[PDB]
Design a protein around this motif. Structure first.
Motif, PDB file in Angstrom:
ATOM      1  N   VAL A   1       0.808  -1.787  -0.570  1.00 31.05           N
ATOM      2  CA  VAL A   1       0.255   0.175   0.164  1.00 31.05           C
ATOM      3  C   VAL A   1       0.767   1.276   0.188  1.00 31.05           C
ATOM      4  O   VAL A   1       1.859   1.363   0.043  1.00 31.05           O
ATOM      5  N   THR A   2       0.724   2.833  -0.262  1.00 26.69           N
ATOM      6  CA  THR A   2       0.567   3.586  -0.910  1.00 26.69           C
ATOM      7  C   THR A   2       1.624   4.063  -1.663  1.00 26.69           C
ATOM      8  O   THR A   2       1.671   5.347  -2.042  1.00 26.69           O
ATOM      9  N   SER A   3       1.614   2.688  -2.227  1.00 31.24           N
ATOM     10  CA  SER A   3       1.842   3.157  -3.740  1.00 31.24           C
ATOM     11  C   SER A   3       1.385   1.857  -4.404  1.00 31.24           C
ATOM     12  O   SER A   3       1.669   2.363  -6.162  1.00 31.24           O
TER      13      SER A   3
ATOM     14  N   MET B   1      -1.869   2.102  -4.721  1.00 33.39           N
ATOM     15  CA  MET B   1      -2.764   3.091  -3.892  1.00 33.39           C
ATOM     16  C   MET B   1      -2.571   4.700  -5.005  1.00 33.39           C
ATOM     17  O   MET B   1      -3.736   5.080  -6.116  1.00 33.39           O
ATOM     18  N   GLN B   2      -1.527   5.180  -5.051  1.00 28.92           N
ATOM     19  CA  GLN B   2      -1.066   6.149  -5.997  1.00 28.92           C
ATOM     20  C   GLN B   2      -0.891   5.367  -7.676  1.00 28.92           C
ATOM     21  O   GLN B   2      -1.995   6.006  -8.529  1.00 28.92           O
ATOM     22  N   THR B   3      -1.257   4.468  -8.336  1.00 30.68           N
ATOM     23  CA  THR B   3      -0.961   4.132  -9.185  1.00 30.68           C
ATOM     24  C   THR B   3      -1.983   3.540  -9.939  1.00 30.68           C
ATOM     25  O   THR B   3      -3.009   4.341 -10.579  1.00 30.68           O
ATOM     26  N   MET B   4      -2.953   2.827  -8.743  1.00 32.44           N
ATOM     27  CA  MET B   4      -4.399   3.360  -8.761  1.00 32.44           C
ATOM     28  C   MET B   4      -4.860   4.708  -9.034  1.00 32.44           C
ATOM     29  O   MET B   4      -6.034   4.558 -10.016  1.00 32.44           O
ATOM     30  N   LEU B   5      -4.726   5.215  -7.827  1.00 37.26           N
ATOM     31  CA  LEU B   5      -5.255   7.291  -7.877  1.00 37.26           C
ATOM     32  C   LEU B   5      -4.968   7.218  -9.764  1.00 37.26           C
ATOM     33  O   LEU B   5      -6.090   8.020 -10.704  1.00 37.26           O
ATOM     34  N   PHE B   6      -4.059   7.140 -10.209  1.00 39.74           N
ATOM     35  CA  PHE B   6      -3.783   7.969 -11.471  1.00 39.74           C
ATOM     36  C   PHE B   6      -4.380   7.161 -12.955  1.00 39.74           C
ATOM     37  O   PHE B   6      -4.502   7.687 -14.183  1.00 39.74           O
ATOM     38  N   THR B   7      -4.636   6.110 -12.276  1.00 35.92           N
ATOM     39  CA  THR B   7      -5.151   4.265 -13.521  1.00 35.92           C
ATOM     40  C   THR B   7      -6.496   5.459 -13.760  1.00 35.92           C
ATOM     41  O   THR B   7      -6.607   5.822 -15.022  1.00 35.92           O
TER      42      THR B   7
END
Ligand SMILES: [Zn+2]
Ligand SMILES: [Zn+2]
Lengths: 139, 927, 73, 117
Positions: free
Chosen positions: A31-33, A35-41
Motif C-alpha cells: 500500500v501507499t504505492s 493506491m497512487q497507481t490506482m488513482l492515476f489509472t
RNA sequence: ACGACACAGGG
RNA sequence: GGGAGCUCCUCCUGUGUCGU
C-alpha cells in the motif's frame, strides 16, 4: 483410514492460513504505492479537459501553491518553471489553467521581486532565475 | 337599531368604555373554543361551539380596537340568581372579573344577562389546546395569541420552519415570551383558590374559565358550604397546564432578586446543593391546592408512581437553581491519614438530593472493590484536573484531564476496485440507472466529535402531564406483562465479548476479561449489593464511528465503565434475555428475519384489525431529545419486575445509579469531561429496550389524546363514548388505579391499534374507520404528542401510510417487504436497498478486505442479505444478486488458480455458494 | 459505465492517497479536503463534482511528496 | 486470575495516589471547611481550586469577547495567559491573533492560563 | 445443541 | 488474547470454521 483424511484436512487448513497471512502482509506492505497507481489509472480514465490540463502542467512543472478555487472572485497562484511553459500557457494578461480564464495581477521572481508582464519576452528571458510565481483570479 | 343600541348602552352601563358590537345584538357563536368538560354525557379536552354569549369589543381613544371584550352570557334565571349569589361572595377577590348582572327586555320580557367585563379574546384553555394539539397548517389561534401579546410579529410567521424546534430554535424565545403571563395566571389561580376556601365554595377549576390575564368567571357549578371549609378541585387544571409551564419557561422570574424580571439574578451561594426549602416554597407558592404529597427528595417516595409525580415537580423546579449545584457531591475521606476526595452522594434534577449509606472515613487500607469504585468515580479525576472553558459548545464542561485537547478525525473508506470493475463489466452503474451508489464512508475533520456532542442542545427540561403519564405507564406495564425478570447471581450472568474495553479509566490496564477474572463471584456480588445502597457515578467515553452510511453526519458511540455494565447485567439481564426470547409479542427484539420470521412478525401485527391500514413514523433526534421523565418512566417499568427480590430502597438506589450512570453522567469527549443533559446512552445494554418502552408510551399517549379530543356528542358507538367518559374519569378523577379499565383500554388498543415495536422503530396496523372518526391515533396525533412531549417537530414527509396489506410495510428496520410466492404459499420477504449492498461490496473499512480471495465469506453474507431482490419486479435488483454469485464464483476460481501456483497443488465444499439453493433455503421455515 | 460513479470512486481514492500523505497534520487543509470529498459524494450533477475534483487534485499536486512523472508514464 | 489481580490493584492504587498529590492543597481544604457539612458539589472543585485554565475558542469574535489581552476574568478570578496554541498544537503568539490575520491560523485556539494571586 | 474465533446485516 | 494504526462501544440476528 479416517486419520489420514483428518491429517490431510489439517494440512489443507494450515496451508490456506499461511496463504492468507502472506497475501495480507503483501497488501499491507505494497500500500501507499499501489493506491497512487490506482488513482492515476482511474484519473486518466475520467478524461476531463480540466483534470488533464492540471496533470500535464504538474508533470511539466506548472504546479499550484494553494487549492484551486471555484469561485469567480477568488485568487490563485502557480509556479512557472520555464519560459516555454509560460509562452504557451499565457498570452498578454489572460491566464489559461484548469480549463478556465484567469487574469494576472502580479508576477514575483525567485527573490520576491515583481517582474513586469512586458519584460517577460523570449529575448530577455534567460537572465532571470525563472521560478516565476504568478498570481491571478478567474474571469 | 334602537334595541341593539340600548343593549349596547346597558352592556357598557357604568364603567366608561367605548364598545363596538362584535357580532350583533344576539349570540356570536364563537368559532370552536377549546373546552374541558365533564358531565353525564360528554368528557374530554375538545373544541366545541360556544353559542350563548353576545360579545363586544372595547376601543380606547383614537378608535382602534383593544384586546378586551365584554362577554354577555344569556343563560336561565335560576342560574342567573345562583351565579349572582356566588359572585357576591368572591366579589372582593382580585382574581375575579367584574360581572354586572342585569335584566334587559330582548324578546319582550326581561331576559336576564350576565356581562363579565374586559376579559380577553382567548382563554387559558385555548392556549393549552393550541400548544398541545399543534397542527402546523391550522395554527391560527397560536399565531393570534403570539401576536396579540407581543411575543413576535406576523413577519416571524412569514419565514419557513418557524414552528420547528430543531430548525429555528428561536421559537423557544418566542414561546418563553409568554412565561410571565402564564405565571401571573398561576398566581391568580392560587388567589382564587384561597378566596373559594375562605368563602366556603366547592367547585371544579377548569382552564376554560380563566382569561389569559388570569381572571375567573362562570360560577355555575359552584356550591356553598360553611365559610372556611371550601375546597376547589384543581386536578385537571394543573395537569393539563403542566406541559406548557416548561415550554414557556414560566418560572424564569423566580431566578431574579425580587421575583421580577428587571432585577439581577440571584447570586446563589456556590457551596449550596440542598435547595429543599426552596422547592417547598415554590410548591406552596404555585401549587398550594394540589392535594397530593410532594417529596422534594424522591428518596422518601412511597412507590414508583410517587417517584414519577415528585420527579415531575422536581424537573419543573430544578430550572430555577444554578446548574453548578447538580451532579456528584464530594467529601474529604482519609485513607491512612491521607486525604481523598470521593463522591458521597448526588444531587439530581429529578430525584433531588440522595446520600450514600456506606460512607466510611478513616480507613487504613482500600479493598479491591473500594479501589474500583474510587477509580470509576469522576470525583478524583475532575478534582485533580484543569478548569475548562469550552466555547465550542453550550453544554456544561467540568474539567480537562489532559494538557492538550484531542481532535479525532475519521478516514475515508477503501475502494474495492476489483468488485467495481466486475460490476461495470456486467452492465452496472450506467447513466440514469435504477441502482446507484449512495452509501459511502464519509470522512470527518477534527471538529466532528465536539460538534456531534453539541447536539444535546435539543434536550430541554420537559414537564409532563402527570395525571396522563401515570396512566399511560399502567398501560405500558400491561404491555410488558408476559416477561420474566428479576435479579440474578454473579454466576448466572452470560457475558459475551469479554475482550472489549472496560471504559474510563479502566481501559488503561486491560480489557473486560481482566476485571471479570480479577473479581471473584462474591466480589461481584458485593459490588452489586453496594450499588443498592450507594450511588456510583461513572464516566462514559465518546468516540467516532467508522462505518458506511448515506448521510455525511458524524456518528459517535459511547463506551461506559466496567462497574456500570457489571452491575446493570445482574440487574436487568434476566428480563432482557426474556424479552429477546419471546415470539409473538409487541416488542419484536431478538426475533430473526430469516426462516420465515418476517412473515410471522407481519402476520402477527395484522392479527384481527377490522379495516386495516398500515402506518409508521419516526422520532427526530430521538437519542438527543428524549426527555428525562420518559427515561425515568422506562427505567421504572423495567425495574417493576423486581417486586420480590428488592425492597423500595434497593429499587430507588438502582434507579439513582441508572440515572447517574446513563441519563446524566459525565461524558469524556476528547480529553475533557462534560455534563450530559439527558438522552440515551449507545453503550448501554438496556437502551434498545428503554427505547421500546418509550415508543409504546408515546403511542399510548397519542391514542388517549386522540380519544379525549373528539366531540363526544358525535361518537355514534355507545361503547366508545362510554370508554372515553371512563378514560377521562380515570385520568383526572380517580386518583387510584382502576385495573379493570386498564385491562379494558389495553384490549381496545390491541384490537384496534396493533403495534410492532423495536428500538424507536414501529409499524402499526390500525382500524382505518376508527382513525378517520378520531377514535384511535393518527399521524397528526403523533405530531402533536411529539411536539408537546418531546420538543421535536415530526415532519409528515418522514412518516408513511399503506392502504393495502398485500403490500407490506413501506419500511421496517431499513427493510422493504414483498409478497413472494414460495412453494404454493405467498410469504413476505424482506429485501434491502440495493445501493446498500453494492456499497458494502465496493467500499471496505480495512485494506486487506480488498483482496477478495481472502474475504469470500464476506460476499456470501452479502448475497444472503441480497437474495430476496431476485423476486423483485425490477430487473437490476435481481441482477445485483446474480452479480454477487458470479463474483463469488470468480473469487473461488482465482483463489484456486493461486493456491495451485505458489504452492505445489491443492484440492471442496464451495460449489454450494455458486447456486441459489443455499440462500433460498435461508428464507424458508426449517421443516 | 457512468461518469458520476467514476468521479465518486476517484474522490474516495484521492482522499485515501491524501490521508496516506499525512494531510491530517494540517487542520485547515484536512478540513477543506474533507469538505470537498463529502460534497463530491453527495453531488447529483456531474458539473460541480468535476470542479471539486479539480480542487482536490490541486491539493494533491501542490505537494512535493507524490512524484507525478513516473505516475503519469 | 491471581497475578493480574495484584497487578491491576497496584496500578489502580498508584493512579489514585498519583492524582491525589496533584490535588491536596490549601484551596481545597479552604473551600471544604466552609461548607456546613463537609459536602460540596463536584462542579465547583475545579471552578474554585484549579490553578490552570484551558479555553477552547472557535472563532475570532469569541476570542475578542473572552480572552482579549494577556489577563482576562472568568469565574470570579484573574487569569494570566501563557502558551496559546492552535489546533495543530503549534505555539501562536498574541500578536498574530488579529482580525485580518485570523484566516491564516488554525482554529480552534487553546488558551492556557494560570490563576493570578 | 453448547462454547471459541472470523465475518455480515439491523443505537 | 490475536490483529491494526497510547486507542480499538452495546444489543439482536445469521452464516463459515473449528471442539464438546
Ligand atoms: Zn411521593
Ligand atoms: Zn431487584
Amino acid at each position: 483410514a479416517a486419520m489420514q483424511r483428518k491429517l490431510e484436512k489439517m494440512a489443507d487448513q494450515a496451508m490456506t492460513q499461511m496463504y492468507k497471512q502472506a497475501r495480507s502482509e503483501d497488501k499491507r506492505a505494497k500500500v501507499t504505492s499501489a493506491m497512487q497507481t490506482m488513482l492515476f489509472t482511474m484519473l486518466r480514465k475520467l478524461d476531463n479537459d480540466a483534470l488533464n490540463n492540471i496533470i500535464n502542467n504538474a508533470r511539466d512543472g506548472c504546479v499550484p501553491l494553494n487549492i484551486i478555487p471555484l469561485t469567480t472572485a477568488a485568487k490563485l497562484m502557480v509556479v512557472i518553471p520555464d519560459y516555454n511553459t509560460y509562452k504557451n500557457t499565457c498570452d498578454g494578461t489572460t491566464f489559461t489553467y484548469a480549463s478556465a480564464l484567469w487574469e494576472i495581477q502580479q508576477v514575483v521572481d525567485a527573490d520576491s521581486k515583481i517582474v513586469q508582464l512586458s519584460e517577460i519576452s523570449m529575448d530577455n528571458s534567460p537572465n532571470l532565475a525563472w521560478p516565476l510565481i504568478v498570481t491571478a483570479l478567474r474571469a | 337599531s334602537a334595541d341593539a343600541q340600548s343593549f349596547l348602552n346597558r352592556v357598557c352601563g357604568v364603567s366608561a368604555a367605548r364598545l363596538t358590537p362584535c357580532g350583533t345584538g344576539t349570540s356570536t357563536d364563537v368559532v370552536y373554543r377549546a373546552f374541558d368538560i365533564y358531565n353525564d354525557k360528554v368528557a374530554g379536552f375538545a373544541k366545541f361551539l360556544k353559542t350563548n354569549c353576545c360579545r363586544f369589543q372595547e376601543k380606547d381613544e383614537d378608535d382602534n380596537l383593544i384586546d378586551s371584550y365584554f362577554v354577555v352570557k344569556r343563560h336561565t334565571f335560576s342560574n342567573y340568581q345562583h351565579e349572582e349569589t356566588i359572585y357576591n361572595l368572591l366579589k372582593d377577590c382580585p382574581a375575579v372579573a367584574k360581572h354586572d348582572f342585569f335584566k334587559f327586555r330582548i324578546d319582550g320580557d326581561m331576559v336576564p344577562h350576565i356581562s363579565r367585563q374586559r376579559l380577553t379574546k382567548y382563554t387559558m384553555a385555548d392556549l393549552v389546546y393550541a400548544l398541545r394539539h399543534f397542527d402546523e397548517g391550522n395554527c391560527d389561534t397560536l399565531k393570534e395569541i403570539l401576536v396579540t401579546y407581543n411575543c413576535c410579529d406576523d413577519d416571524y410567521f412569514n419565514k419557513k420552519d418557524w414552528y420547528d424546534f430543531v430548525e429555528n430554535p428561536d421559537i423557544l424565545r418566542v414561546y418563553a415570551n409568554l412565561g410571565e403571563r402564564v405565571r401571573q395566571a398561576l398566581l391568580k389561580t392560587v388567589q382564587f383558590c384561597d378566596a373559594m376556601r375562605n368563602a366556603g365554595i366547592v367547585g371544579v377549576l377548569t382552564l376554560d374559565n380563566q382569561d389569559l390575564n388570569g381572571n375567573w368567571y362562570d360560577f355555575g357549578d359552584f356550591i356553598q358550604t360553611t365559610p372556611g371549609s371550601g375546597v376547589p378541585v384543581v386536578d385537571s387544571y394543573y395537569s393539563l397546564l403542566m406541559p406548557i409551564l416548561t415550554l414557556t419557561r414560566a418560572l424564569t422570574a423566580e431566578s431574579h432578586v425580587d421575583t421580577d424580571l428587571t432585577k439581577p439574578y440571584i447570586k446563589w451561594d456556590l457551596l449550596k446543593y440542598d435547595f429543599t426549602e426552596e422547592r417547598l416554597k415554590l410548591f406552596d407558592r404555585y401549587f398550594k391546592y394540589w392535594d397530593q404529597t410532594y417529596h422534594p427528595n424522591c428518596v422518601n417516595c412511597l412507590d414508583d408512581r410517587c417517584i414519577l409525580h415528585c420527579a415531575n415537580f422536581n424537573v419543573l423546579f430544578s430550572t430555577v437553581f444554578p446548574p453548578t449545584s447538580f451532579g456528584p457531591l464530594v467529601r474529604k475521606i482519609f485513607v491512612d491519614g491521607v486525604p481523598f476526595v470521593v463522591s458521597t452522594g448526588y444531587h439530581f434534577r429529578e430525584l433531588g438530593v440522595v446520600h450514600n449509606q456506606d460512607v466510611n472515613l478513616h480507613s487504613s487500607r482500600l479493598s479491591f472493590k473500594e479501589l474500583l469504585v474510587y477509580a470509576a468515580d469522576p470525583a478524583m479525576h475532575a478534582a485533580s484536573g484543569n478548569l475548562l472553558l469550552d466555547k465550542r459548545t453550550t453544554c456544561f464542561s467540568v474539567a480537562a484531564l489532559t494538557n492538550n485537547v484531542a481532535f479525532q478525525t475519521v478516514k475515508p473508506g477503501n475502494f474495492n476496485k476489483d468488485f467495481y470493475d466486475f460490476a461495470v463489466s456486467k452492465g452496472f452503474f450506467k447513466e440514469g440507472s435504477s441502482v446507484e451508489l449512495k452509501h459511502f464512508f464519509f470522512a470527518q475533520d477534527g471538529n466532528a466529535a465536539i460538534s456531534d456532542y453539541d447536539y444535546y442542545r435539543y434536550n430541554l427540561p420537559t414537564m409532563c402531564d402527570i395525571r396522563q403519564l401515570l396512566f399511560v405507564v399502567e398501560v405500558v406495564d400491561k404491555y410488558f406483562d408476559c416477561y420474566d425478570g428479576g435479579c440474578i447471581n454473579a454466576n448466572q450472568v452470560i457475558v459475551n465479548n469479554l475482550d472489549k474495553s472496560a471504559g474510563f479509566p479502566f481501559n488503561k490496564w486491560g480489557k473486560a476479561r481482566l476485571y471479570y477474572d480479577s473479581m471473584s463471584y462474591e466480589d461481584q456480588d458485593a459490588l452489586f449489593a453496594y450499588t443498592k445502597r450507594n450511588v456510583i457515578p461513572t464516566i462514559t467515553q465518546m468516540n467516532l464511528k467508522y462505518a458506511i452510511s448515506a448521510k455525511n453526519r458524524a456518528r459517535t458511540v459511547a463506551g461506559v465503565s466496567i462497574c456500570s455494565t457489571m452491575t446493570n447485567r445482574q440487574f436487568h439481564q434476566k428480563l432482557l434475555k426474556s424479552i429477546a426470547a419471546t415470539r409473538g409479542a409487541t416488542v419484536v427484539i431478538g426475533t430473526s428475519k430469516f426462516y420465515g420470521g418476517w412473515h410471522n412478525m407481519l402476520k402477527t401485527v395484522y392479527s384481527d384489525v377490522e379495516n386495516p391500514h398500515l402506518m409508521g413514523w419516526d422520532y427526530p433526534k430521538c437519542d438527543r431529545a428524549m426527555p428525562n421523565m420518559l427515561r425515568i418512566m422506562a427505567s421504572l417499568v423495567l425495574a417493576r419486575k423486581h417486586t420480590t427480590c428488592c425492597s423500595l430502597s434497593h429499587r430507588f438506589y438502582r434507579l439513582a445509579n441508572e440515572c447517574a450512570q446513563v441519563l446524566s453522567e459525565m461524558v469524556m469527549c476528547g480529553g475533557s469531561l462534560y455534563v450530559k443533559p439527558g438522552g440515551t446512552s449507545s453503550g448501554d445494554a438496556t437502551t434498545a429496550y428503554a427505547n421500546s418502552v418509550f415508543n409504546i408510551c408515546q403511542a399510548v399517549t397519542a391514542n388517549v389524546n386522540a380519544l379525549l379530543s373528539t366531540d363526544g356528542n358525535k361518537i355514534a358507538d355507545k361503547y366508545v363514548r362510554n370508554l372515553q367518559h371512563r378514560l377521562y374519569e380515570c385520568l383526572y378523577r380517580n386518583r387510584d388505579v382502576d385495573t379493570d379499565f386498564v385491562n379494558e383500554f389495553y384490549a381496545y388498543l390491541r384490537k384496534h391499534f396493533s403495534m410492532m415495536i423495536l428500538s424507536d422503530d414501529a409499524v402499526v396496523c390500525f382500524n382505518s374507520t376508527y382513525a378517520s372518526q378520531g377514535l384511535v391515533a393518527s399521524i397528526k396525533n403523533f405530531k402533536s404528542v411529539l411536539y408537546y412531549q418531546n420538543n421535536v417537530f415530526m415532519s409528515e414527509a418522514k412518516c408513511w401510510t399503506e392502504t393495502d396489506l398485500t403490500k407490506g410495510p413501506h419500511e421496517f428496520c431499513s427493510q422493504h417487504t414483498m409478497l413472494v410466492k414460495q412453494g404454493d404459499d405467498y410469504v413476505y420477504l424482506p429485501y434491502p436497498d440495493p445501493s446498500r449492498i453494492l456499497g458494502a461490496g465496493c467500499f471496505v473499512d480495512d485494506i486487506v478486505k480488498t483482496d477478495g480471495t481472502l474475504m469470500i465469506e464476506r460476499f456470501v453474507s452479502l448475497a444472503i442479505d441480497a437474495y430476496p431482490l431476485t423476486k423483485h419486479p425490477n430487473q437490476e435488483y435481481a441482477d445485483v444478486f446474480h452479480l454477487y454469485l458470479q463474483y463469488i464464483r470468480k473469487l473461488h476460481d482465482e483463489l484456486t488458480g493461486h493456491m495451485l501456483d505458489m504452492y505445489s497443488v491443492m484440492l471442496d465444499n464451495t460449489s454450494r455458494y455458486w447456486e441459489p439453493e443455499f440462500y433460498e433455503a435461508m428464507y424458508t421455515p426449517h421443516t | 459505465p457512468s461518469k458520476m460513479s467514476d468521479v465518486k470512486c476517484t474522490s474516495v481514492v484521492l482522499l485515501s492517497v491524501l490521508q496516506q500523505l499525512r494531510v491530517e497534520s494540517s487542520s485547515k487543509l484536512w478540513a477543506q479536503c474533507v469538505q470537498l470529498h463529502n460534497d463530491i459524494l453527495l453531488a447529483k450533477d456531474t458539473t460541480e463534482a468535476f470542479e471539486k475534483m479539480v480542487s482536490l487534485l490541486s491539493v494533491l499536486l501542490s505537494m512535493q511528496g507524490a512524484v507525478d512523472i513516473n505516475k503519469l508514464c
